[PDB]
């Protein structure tokens, strides 16, 4: 039948076109930035009383 079983030729494989289960998309949540409420107390200022 021209159908031998010996050849280990396992082809190339199979292309996974899609996945059975879709991947949900979560909302991106960043974090602190340059003015991320930090303590530095350089000046402490001086508020003169007007009256």
């Amino acid at each position: 039948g021209a159908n031998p079983f010996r050849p280990p030729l396992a082809h190339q494989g199979l292309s996974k076109a899609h996945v059975v289960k879709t991947a949900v998309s979560v909302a991106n949540r960043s974090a602190g930035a340059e003015p991320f409420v930090t303590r530095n107390d350089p000046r402490a200022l001086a508020m003169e009383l007007a009256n």
Binding site: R43, A44, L45, M47, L49, A50, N51
Partner: peptide, 8 residues
């Protein structure tokens, strides 16, 4: 960045 009472 500071607070106070202007009238006092």
């Amino acid at each position: 960045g500071s607070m106070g009472f202007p009238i006092l």
